[PDB]
Each structure stands twice: as C-alpha cells, then as structure tokens.
C-alpha cells in the first residue's frame, strides 16, 4: 500500500506537453509498506531450507 | 474570545478555532470562571464519569468531519466557557488550547 | 484525587514565584504532572509539564525562562517562576496528566503521537 493521500497537480510546460506532479498531501504522513505475512513466510522459508 | 448564543432546549454547536489536518484527538474542556476545568471529552468521543449524557462529540471517522461539540438540552449550568484541545499528525506538539469561545445563552 | 494549592500572593519583578501543591490518596509513579495558568483577560496557557525521571520541556513561546521542578520526599508539585512580568499576574491551577497514544498507522514506523488528557483540576490562587 501507499497509505498518504496524495493529490494529482497539472502543471502548465508547453503546449500539449502537460507536468502532472504531486500536489498537497492530505490527510496523515505515512510510509508505504507491504504486509508479507509471517507464518506462510514461516513455512516457506523453512522449505526453502530443505 | 467568541460569543455564540443558543435557546434553551436546542443542540449548541461549538466549533474549534483551529481546523483538522490528518487524524486527530480533540479535548474538550468547560470553564466557568472561578471555577475549575472539567475534562469532558477526549480521544474523541470517551466521556468520563460525572460528565452527563448531554455532552457529545463527533467521532474521528475518516477526514473531513469537523469538530463539534453537542450540547442537547442546554440548562443554566452550562454557561461557562468551552475549550477545544485539538493534537494532529503533522502540526507535531500543540502546546497552545487555542482560541476559547465564550458561551451565553 | 485532590489537589490544592498554595503561593505567595506578590514578588517584585525579576523574583522567583514559588506554588506549593500538595496532592493526596494516590501513588506518585502512576500519573504525569503538569501546571496550568490562566492569564485574566486572555486564555489558558500551558507553562510546562514534568515527568516521573525530573524530565520537563517547555514553551517555545515562554522562550525558556520556566523551570518545573519536582520533590517526592514530602509529596508535593512544585513550582519555580524567574524573571517576572505584570503580564504573569494570573491565576495558577495545577492538575495531573495521562499520556494517551492515538495510533494512525504501523506502530513499528513510529506512526503515533502522544498527547495528554487533564481530568482533575485545582481551585485556582491569584497573586500579583
Ligand atoms: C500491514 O500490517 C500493519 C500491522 O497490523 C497494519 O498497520 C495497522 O494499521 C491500522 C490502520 O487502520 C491500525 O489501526 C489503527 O489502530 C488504532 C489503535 O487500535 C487499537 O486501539 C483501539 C482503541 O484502544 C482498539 O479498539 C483496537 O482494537 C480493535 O482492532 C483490533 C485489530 O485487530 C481488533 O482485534 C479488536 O478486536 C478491535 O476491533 C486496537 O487495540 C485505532 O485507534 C485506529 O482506528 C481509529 O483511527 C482511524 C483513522 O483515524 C479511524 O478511521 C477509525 O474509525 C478509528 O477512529 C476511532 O477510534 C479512535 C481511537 O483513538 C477514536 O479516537 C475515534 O474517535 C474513533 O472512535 C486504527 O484502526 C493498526 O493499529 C496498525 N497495526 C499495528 C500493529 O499498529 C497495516 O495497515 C497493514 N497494511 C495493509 C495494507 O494491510
Ligand atoms: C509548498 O510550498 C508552497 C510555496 O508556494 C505552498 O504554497 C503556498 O503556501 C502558503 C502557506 O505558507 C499559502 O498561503 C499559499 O496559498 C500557497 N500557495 C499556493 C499557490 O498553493 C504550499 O502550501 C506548500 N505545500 C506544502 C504541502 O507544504
Ligand atoms: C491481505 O489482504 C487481504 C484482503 O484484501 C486478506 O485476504 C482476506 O482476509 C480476510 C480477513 O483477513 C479473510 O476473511 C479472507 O478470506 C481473505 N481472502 C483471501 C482471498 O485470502 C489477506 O488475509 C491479507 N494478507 C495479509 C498477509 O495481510
Ligand atoms: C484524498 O484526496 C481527495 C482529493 O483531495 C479527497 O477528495 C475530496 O474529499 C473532500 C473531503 O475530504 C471533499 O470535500 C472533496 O469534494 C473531495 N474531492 C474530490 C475531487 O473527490 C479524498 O476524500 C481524499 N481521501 C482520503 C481517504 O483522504
Ligand atoms: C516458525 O516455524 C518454526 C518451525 O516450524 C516454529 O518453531 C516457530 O515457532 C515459528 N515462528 C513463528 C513466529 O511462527
């Protein structure tokens, strides 16, 4: 996940070409992180060991 | 600093001096002069004991919902002056209450 | 739990205000600490807090001339207030704090922000 709320900025370059940044962040700060288990990375690790 | 005026009987809606940002947990505190501070509501929504049922708060779900404190059936022992204590995620410490809002009816 | 306090009315300025809090029926080791005061005209301004290792921080807008201190051989607050002003001439209320923690997020990343709740309050002393 990329739990922060961010906003979408278009930002004006040249004709056509349009900079689509990061504009305000809402809402919490936080950090992305992915959620990898821990018991099926127990036995998987462990068959991996065999 | 702020006068707001309300009926007897209707819902007094106090809203904070300061605006939310992120998640939040707003205090919220009664002040007759002379008299010392009560805590009424914090995290939000817990209401401590001695603190009547009239006293509620709007619970922390999602972003966007304002602060306000409920007064339902307002009675002469409401008027004092009402504080809202408010922490956030990313204006760090707030050592400061605020602005106070003072309360006639 | 109870608190009262006491102090001594009128210092001249640039002189220590000194408040005496004696507070019965608990423990000591279970609660923070805190002091309040109320400037008349004006709101509550928080002057400091204290913890149970003699740990206190302070406003940056009182600039740091505060100092919160503690003694727990006679069971008491205290409270110590150097280089006075007319605009210090304010009621002085003291109460306990507990440290609530509001998660928002993963507790291992540091996700969270302390914050302190005061349900018990003093009658409030003015001195001048
Ligand atoms: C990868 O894994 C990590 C590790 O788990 C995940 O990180 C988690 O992220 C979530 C984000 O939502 C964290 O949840 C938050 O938890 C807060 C604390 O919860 C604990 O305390 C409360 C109150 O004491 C208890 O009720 C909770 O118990 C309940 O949840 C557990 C979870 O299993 C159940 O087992 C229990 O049976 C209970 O059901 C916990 O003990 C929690 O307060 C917070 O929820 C509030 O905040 C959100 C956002 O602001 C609001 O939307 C929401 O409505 C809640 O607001 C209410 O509660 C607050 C309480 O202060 C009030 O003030 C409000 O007014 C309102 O009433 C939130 O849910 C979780 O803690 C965290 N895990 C760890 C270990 O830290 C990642 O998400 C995960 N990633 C992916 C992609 O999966
Ligand atoms: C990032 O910096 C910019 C600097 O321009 C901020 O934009 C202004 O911020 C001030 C607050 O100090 C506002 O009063 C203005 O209205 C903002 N102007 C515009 C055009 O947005 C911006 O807020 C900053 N963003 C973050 C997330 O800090
Ligand atoms: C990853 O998230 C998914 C949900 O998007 C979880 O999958 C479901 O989880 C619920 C309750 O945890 C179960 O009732 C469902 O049966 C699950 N569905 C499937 C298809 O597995 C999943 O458990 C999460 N995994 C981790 C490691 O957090
Ligand atoms: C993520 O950001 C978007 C855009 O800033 C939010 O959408 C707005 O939400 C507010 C209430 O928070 C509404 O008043 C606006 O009308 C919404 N605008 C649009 C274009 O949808 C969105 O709610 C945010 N989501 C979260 C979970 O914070
Ligand atoms: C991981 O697996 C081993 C062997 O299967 C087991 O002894 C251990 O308790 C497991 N640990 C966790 C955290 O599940």
């Known amino acids: 996940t990329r739990p922060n709320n961010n906003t979408r900025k278009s930002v004006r370059i040249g004709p056509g070409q349009w900079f689509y940044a990061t504009g305000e962040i809402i809402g919490d700060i936080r950090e992305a992180h992915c959620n990898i288990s821990r018991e099926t990375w127990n036995s998987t690790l462990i068959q991996v060991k065999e | 600093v702020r006068p707001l005026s309300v009926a007897l009987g209707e819902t007094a809606r106090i809203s904070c001096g300061r605006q939310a940002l992120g998640s939040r947990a707003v205090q919220w505190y009664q002040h007759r002069p002379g008299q010392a501070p009560i805590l009424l509501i914090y995290n939000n929504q817990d209401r401590p004991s001695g603190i009547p049922e009239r006293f509620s708060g709007t619970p922390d779900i999602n972003f966007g919902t304002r602060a306000t404190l409920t007064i339902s059936g307002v009675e002469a022992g409401d008027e004092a002056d009402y504080y809202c204590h408010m922490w956030d995620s990313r204006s760090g410490f707030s050592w400061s209450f605020g602005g106070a809002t003072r309360l006639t009816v | 739990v109870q608190l009262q306090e006491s102090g001594p009315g009128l210092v001249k300025p640039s002189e220590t205000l000194s408040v005496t809090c004696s507070v019965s029926?608990?423990?000591?080791?279970?609660?923070?600490w805190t002091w309040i005061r109320q400037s008349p005209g004006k709101g509550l301004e928080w002057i400091g807090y204290?913890?149970?290792?003699?740990?206190?921080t302070y406003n940056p807008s009182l600039n740091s001339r505060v100092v919160i201190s503690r003694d727990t051989s006679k069971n008491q607050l205290s409270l110590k207030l150097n280089s006075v002003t007319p605009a210090d001439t304010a009621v002085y209320y003291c109460?306990?704090?507990?440290?609530?923690?509001?998660?928002?997020?993963?507790?291992?990343?540091?996700?969270?922000?302390?914050?302190?709740?005061?349900?018990?309050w003093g009658k409030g002393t003015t001195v001048t």
């Open positions: 204290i913890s149970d290792r003699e740990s206190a």
């Open positions: 029926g608990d423990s000591m080791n279970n609660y923070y």
């Open positions: 109460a306990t704090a507990r440290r609530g923690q509001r998660i928002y997020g993963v507790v291992s990343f540091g996700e969270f922000f302390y914050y302190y709740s005061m349900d018990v």
